[PDB]
Design an enzyme around this catalytic site. Structure first.
Site, PDB file in Angstrom:
ATOM      1  N   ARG A  49       3.570   2.503 -11.066  1.00 46.25           N
ATOM      2  CA  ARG A  49       3.820   1.109 -10.991  1.00 46.25           C
ATOM      3  C   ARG A  49       3.862   0.750 -12.638  1.00 46.25           C
ATOM      4  O   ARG A  49       4.667  -0.017 -13.114  1.00 46.25           O
ATOM      5  CB  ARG A  49       2.639   0.275 -10.380  1.00 46.25           C
ATOM      6  CG  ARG A  49       2.876   0.405  -8.849  1.00 46.25           C
ATOM      7  CD  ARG A  49       1.659  -0.255  -8.254  1.00 46.25           C
ATOM      8  NE  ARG A  49       1.363   0.322  -6.985  1.00 46.25           N
ATOM      9  CZ  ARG A  49       0.370   0.052  -6.141  1.00 46.25           C
ATOM     10  NH1 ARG A  49      -0.625  -1.053  -6.425  1.00 46.25           N
ATOM     11  NH2 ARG A  49       0.248   0.694  -5.049  1.00 46.25           N
ATOM     12  N   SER A  50       2.855   1.347 -13.537  1.00 48.27           N
ATOM     13  CA  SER A  50       2.835   0.825 -14.758  1.00 48.27           C
ATOM     14  C   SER A  50       4.011   1.249 -15.596  1.00 48.27           C
ATOM     15  O   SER A  50       4.603   0.440 -16.499  1.00 48.27           O
ATOM     16  CB  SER A  50       1.722   1.525 -15.449  1.00 48.27           C
ATOM     17  OG  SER A  50       0.286   1.137 -15.008  1.00 48.27           O
TER      18      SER A  50
ATOM     19  N   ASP B 152       0.807  -1.130   0.153  1.00 49.84           N
ATOM     20  CA  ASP B 152       0.010   0.178  -0.066  1.00 49.84           C
ATOM     21  C   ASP B 152       0.848   1.188  -0.137  1.00 49.84           C
ATOM     22  O   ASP B 152       0.364   2.324  -0.644  1.00 49.84           O
ATOM     23  CB  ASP B 152      -0.723   0.096   1.214  1.00 49.84           C
ATOM     24  CG  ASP B 152      -2.318  -0.445   1.276  1.00 49.84           C
ATOM     25  OD1 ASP B 152      -2.516  -1.151  -0.117  1.00 49.84           O
ATOM     26  OD2 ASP B 152      -3.231  -0.325   1.900  1.00 49.84           O
TER      27      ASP B 152
ATOM     28  N   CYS C 253      -2.519   0.602 -13.405  1.00 48.96           N
ATOM     29  CA  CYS C 253      -2.542   0.476 -11.960  1.00 48.96           C
ATOM     30  C   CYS C 253      -3.500   1.519 -11.824  1.00 48.96           C
ATOM     31  O   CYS C 253      -4.878   1.348 -12.184  1.00 48.96           O
ATOM     32  CB  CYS C 253      -0.901   1.117 -11.554  1.00 48.96           C
ATOM     33  SG  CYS C 253      -0.336   2.451 -12.252  1.00 48.96           S
TER      34      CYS C 253
ATOM     35  N   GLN D 113       6.658   7.805 -10.653  1.00 50.73           N
ATOM     36  CA  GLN D 113       6.203   8.967  -9.619  1.00 50.73           C
ATOM     37  C   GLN D 113       6.750   9.370  -8.648  1.00 50.73           C
ATOM     38  O   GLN D 113       6.459  10.517  -8.107  1.00 50.73           O
ATOM     39  CB  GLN D 113       4.696   8.486  -9.286  1.00 50.73           C
ATOM     40  CG  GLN D 113       3.585   8.435 -10.370  1.00 50.73           C
ATOM     41  CD  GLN D 113       2.340   7.823  -9.700  1.00 50.73           C
ATOM     42  OE1 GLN D 113       2.067   6.841  -9.132  1.00 50.73           O
ATOM     43  NE2 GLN D 113       1.235   8.681  -9.530  1.00 50.73           N
TER      44      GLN D 113
HETATM   45  F1  JOM Z   1      -2.508  14.468  -8.342  1.00 49.35           F
HETATM   46  C1  JOM Z   1      -2.062  13.512  -8.769  1.00 49.35           C
HETATM   47  F2  JOM Z   1      -2.091  13.786 -10.085  1.00 49.35           F
HETATM   48  F3  JOM Z   1      -0.872  14.088  -8.487  1.00 49.35           F
HETATM   49  C2  JOM Z   1      -1.963  12.147  -8.443  1.00 49.35           C
HETATM   50  C3  JOM Z   1      -2.600  11.827  -6.943  1.00 49.35           C
HETATM   51  C4  JOM Z   1      -2.392  10.560  -6.460  1.00 49.35           C
HETATM   52  C5  JOM Z   1      -2.157   9.410  -7.432  1.00 49.35           C
HETATM   53  N1  JOM Z   1      -2.466   8.344  -6.828  1.00 49.35           N
HETATM   54  C6  JOM Z   1      -1.916   7.276  -7.457  1.00 49.35           C
HETATM   55  N2  JOM Z   1      -1.306   7.130  -8.686  1.00 49.35           N
HETATM   56  N3  JOM Z   1      -0.886   5.712  -9.019  1.00 49.35           N
HETATM   57  C7  JOM Z   1      -1.403   4.728  -8.378  1.00 49.35           C
HETATM   58  S1  JOM Z   1      -1.384   3.152  -8.225  1.00 49.35           S
HETATM   59  S2  JOM Z   1      -2.276   5.506  -6.680  1.00 49.35           S
HETATM   60  C8  JOM Z   1      -2.003  10.031  -8.752  1.00 49.35           C
HETATM   61  C9  JOM Z   1      -1.817  11.088  -9.229  1.00 49.35           C
END
Ligand code: JOM
Ligand code: JOM
Length: 283
Positions: A221-222, A181, A215, A262
């Protein structure tokens, strides 16, 4: 520099955040005007994650051809991937329409339906053989054929039927179920074993349409999955495997979808996976 020793040099100097911020600064910026049209607001999970216009997948529909999905085409490695968000309640039919129209064999899922107590994507495939799913907006039927549950991942055989033409196809669902998580895995061993299982199935091969990988947002992850696959393929193809530069490969992939990888922890994990994977391929 080579990879494994560039790696120890970043660890000892504790500069992963600075390396990752350089990548973010140099990454491509292309328009995503179709994604931001008002009629498409409920087709996007996150307002800051959008496909570029030049590389987006188009649905074969005259009303609205939009889906949050991008074609990543790696010319030297001769591999293509479709990276997409986890389907939303109002896009599950579009998702399977894309799989059908692009002639994909495999779907790679790197998240759980619920994580951190919240929904990360819709339950978009059937869980019991005798309870099939019909997507009326796109005229498709989806049936669970078999399921094999292992300790780190599950593989499912699915039948997708185009109800307009009565044609059927076998789709393989590769579900990595153990990504934590928070953070990244401590060892890349189970992720690499999973990648090799996808490869062995034929789902990444040129005789099929591109694999669909997702994902929750389709970038983190992708991105790790396709970056590791492409880097390991280039190390097999080239006369000098130490010439493969993972930062350059990542910037090439970011010409086709924004935001791939990310966090600095995901960047470090990608290095670790390629380094360990290169020893198993041969040494
Ligand atoms: F705002 C934002 F764009 F920045 C942003 C915030 C939150 C996520 N959460 C997740 N990405 N991938 C997952 S697996 S969970 C993605 C993007
Ligand atoms: F769609 C498909 F390709 F995934 C597929 C559908 C149906 C079968 N039938 C049987 N498997 N074992 C039997 S005993 S009968 C096999 C594959």
């Amino acid at each position: 520099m080579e990879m494994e020793k560039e790696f120890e040099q970043i660890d000892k100097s504790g500069s992963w955040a600075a390396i990752y911020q350089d990548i973010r600064h140099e990454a491509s910026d292309f328009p995503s005007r179709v994604a931001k049209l008002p009629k498409n607001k409920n087709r996007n999970r996150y307002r800051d994650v959008s496909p570029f216009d030049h590389s987006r997948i188009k649905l074969h529909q005259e009303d609205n051809d939009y889906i949050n999905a991008s074609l990543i085409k790696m010319e030297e490695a001769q591999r293509s991937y479709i990276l997409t968000q986890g389907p939303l309640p109002n896009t599950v039919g579009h998702f399977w329409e894309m799989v059908w129209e692009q002639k994909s064999r495999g779907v790679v899922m790197l998240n759980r339906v619920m994580e951190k107590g919240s929904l990360k994507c819709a339950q978009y495939w059937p869980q019991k053989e005798e309870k099939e799913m019909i997507f009326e907006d796109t005229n498709l039927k989806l049936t669970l054929i078999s399921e094999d549950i292992k300790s780190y991942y599950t593989v499912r055989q699915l039948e997708l039927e185009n109800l307009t033409t009565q044609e059927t196809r076998e789709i393989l669902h590769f579900h990595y179920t153990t990504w934590p998580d928070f953070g990244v895995p401590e060892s890349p061993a189970s992720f690499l074993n999973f990648l090799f299982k996808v490869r062995e199935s034929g789902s990444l091969s040129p005789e099929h349409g591109p694999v669909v990988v997702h994902c929750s947002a389709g970038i983190g992850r992708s991105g790790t999955f396709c970056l590791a696959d492409t880097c390991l393929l280039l190390m097999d193809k080239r006369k000098d495997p130490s010439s493969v530069d993972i930062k350059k490969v990542l910037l090439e992939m970011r010409k086709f979808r924004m935001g791939l990888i990310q966090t600095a922890d995901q960047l470090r994990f990608s290095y670790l996976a390629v380094i360990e994977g290169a020893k198993f391929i041969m040494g």
